[PDB]
Structure 1
Amino acid sequence: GIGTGFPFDPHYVEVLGERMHYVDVGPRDGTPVLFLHGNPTSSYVWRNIIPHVAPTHRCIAPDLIGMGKSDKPDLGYFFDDHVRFMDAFIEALGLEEVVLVIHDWGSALGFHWAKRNPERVKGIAFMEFIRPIPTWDEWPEFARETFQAFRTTDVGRKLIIDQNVFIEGTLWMGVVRPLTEVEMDHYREPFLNPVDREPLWRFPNELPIAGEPANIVALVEEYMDWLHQSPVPKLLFWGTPGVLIPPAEAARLAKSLPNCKAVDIGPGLNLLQEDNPDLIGSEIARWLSTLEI
């Protein structure tokens, strides 16, 4: 079935006095493809997509600061912290122009960086991405009560940090097919020390839902305005029923984003990579061949 192994040699780079881990495969010459995961995942989420792209393009997949095999300093892990570390990661590797492949909070990082560096982004492939959720009615019903509890300090931290609910419960609820024990262990590994679960709690508290927190809402609105104006080639993957991007929203985006190709992956929730990695990787690989790179 879907591959469970992580057959990538570790690479580390110094970023702002810490070290970040990243996958780095594929040819050295050309435009690199930068894969950005979100919550509560790591570069592991790209393990079955990267092999479709690596034959033709360099694939760089960092673990966000505090996650995967990256260092876990004593930060709050605000979106601003992820921005600072990812900006510095890209510069530390000397990347010039890139293609972005982005998901969940990795998509907020990717779109925010693209808005600020438009001349350096030659294409964006994205899925289940951060957009403003104007009211809780747009969040899926079965998951509203949980995310509302996550978005508190005392109850939410007890759930996410003390009891590891984002890993043990939410993650499994983000894939239609059942994650296997080996896959769960790969997702659990970075967070075996409860103190290291800080980013898993801060992330849902940063989600731009019903206008709060206002700083995140504004930043996400700004990159969405940029995206609808930009001629950058776009590739949107979507599934049914989705979580962040239900089918009706995917359809709205497909007709209103310039130069946008849209691919229905079939059944999918949030981690679309875990329900249909082969279609995602194969379509990205072919789409890269149509770009001016």
Structure 2
Amino acid sequence: AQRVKITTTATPGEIELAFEDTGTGLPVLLVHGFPLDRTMWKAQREELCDEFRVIVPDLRGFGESQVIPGVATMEAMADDLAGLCNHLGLTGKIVLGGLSMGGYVAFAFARKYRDRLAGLILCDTRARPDSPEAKENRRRVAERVRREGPGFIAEEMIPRLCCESTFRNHPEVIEKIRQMILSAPPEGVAAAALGMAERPDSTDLLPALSCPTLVLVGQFDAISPPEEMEAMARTIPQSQFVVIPDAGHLPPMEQPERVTQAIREWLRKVHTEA
């Protein structure tokens, strides 16, 4: 892993990002969820790198990246990704993938940097904005986590994040997720919670997308359910919809091989169509 100060068009203009960059060829940038870190995507980075160049950053406020107090908007996170790609000399097109909050970041990137996208991978995510109650919940989480840290988030979220089969067959995956959450910087968690509350509605963005899009969901995802994601895919042109069996909200970790293969075979199509 690497740590680099990048130039970003978002406040504060410069930020230190930690990231992995593994493989050669077509760049595929994978964005973790909330309140996780780059290691969420480890299996896909380690396996897809035989064929693609896989770049996996810690978002601002997460993992080993710099924490920027206040509000970390989805736009700002996307701006940081554009800055990272600029740093790396990936100044043309990329494939951008994200899970859940990382999907929100991908929408923000697509709004602003459409000419930089060869493709989008939207995993276990939603196009709608937060409802008023959800926004209030963000705010209450932000104010709590600043002072108490993310233990309460792990307690609340872990039963909702993975399916029963993962708890039974892969307790080590559950523990790895728990440690990601417990290690998340408190102010980074807070800033991202507030940022999620202010993200725009991406409903009308969907029909305007201009690249192939893979829409991936766990069969048992309790947070961004498959029926909702299917409906989302029906408004995205050039979509492919994949349900990963025997996974909840974190397919990349729960069913790593199946996720890697779905992404690999779709990337080959995108490449052929391009």
TM more than 0.5: yes
Q: 1:120 to 1:73 in 2, by over 3 A?
A: closer
Q: 1:148 to 1:12 in 2, by over 3 A?
A: closer
What is the CA–CA distance in structure 2 between the aligned matches of 1:150 and 1:255, rounded to whole Å?
29
Matched, 1:240 2:219: yes
Equivalent residue letter for 1:13: V
Equivalent residue letter for 1:237: L
Matched, 1:49 2:40: no
Matched, 1:26 2:17: no
Equivalent residue letter for 1:266: P
Q: How far did 1:125 drift?
A: 1.4
Q: How far did 1:262 drift?
A: 1.0
Task: Give per-residue Cα distances to partners, 1:50-97, cap 9 Å, x unaligned.
Answer: 233111110000101111111234444343542443332222222121
Match of 2:121 in 1: 125
- 2:22–2:54 Cα contact (<8 Å) kept: yes
Name the count of aligned residue pairs. 258
Match of 1:166 in 2: 153
- 1:150–1:160 Cα contact (<8 Å) kept: no
What is the CA–CA distance in structure 1 between the aligned matches of 2:196 and 2:269, rounded to whole Å?
34
Q: How far did 1:151 drift?
A: 3.0
Matched, 1:99 2:95: yes
What is the CA–CA distance in structure 1 between the aligned matches of 2:17 and 2:154, rounded to whole Å?
21
Equivalent position to 1:157, from 114, 123, 143 = 143
Equivalent residue letter for 2:15: E
Match of 2:31 in 1: 36
Q: TM-score, normalised by structure 1?
A: 0.76
Write the mapping of 1:143-154 to structure 2, written as runs, cut at 5 A: 150-153=137-140
What is the CA–CA distance in structure 2 between the aligned matches of 1:33 and 1:82, rounded to whole Å?
17
- 1:77–1:198 Cα contact (<8 Å) kept: no
Equivalent residue letter for 1:19: E
Deviating more after overlay: 246-255 vs 69-78: 69-78
- 1:100–1:121 Cα contact (<8 Å) kept: yes
Q: TM-score, normalised by structure 2?
A: 0.81
Unpaired runs of 5+ residues, structure 2, are 7-12
Please give the secondary structure, in 2, of the residue aligned with 1:55.
Answer: coil
Match of 2:3 in 1: 12
What is the CA–CA distance in structure 2 between the aligned matches of 1:291 and 1:285, rounded to whole Å?
10
Q: CA RMSD in A?
A: 2.8
Equivalent position to 2:106, from 104, 110, 131 = 110
Matched, 1:183 2:184: no
Write the mapping of 1:135-284 to structure 2, written as runs, cut at 5 A: 135=131, 150-153=137-140, 157-158=143-144, 161-164=147-150, 165-176=152-163, 177-178=166-167, 179-180=171-172, 182-184=175-177, 186-188=179-181, 190-191=183-184, 196-207=185-196, 213=198, 216-217=199-200, 220-221=201-202, 224-284=203-263
Q: 1:267 to 1:204 in 2, by over 3 A?
A: farther
Task: Give per-residue Cα distances to partners, 1:213-240, cap 9 Å, x unaligned.
Answer: 4xx23xx33xx42332334111111123
- 2:217–2:249 Cα contact (<8 Å) kept: no
Please give the secondary structure, in 2, of the residue aligned with 1:225.
Answer: coil
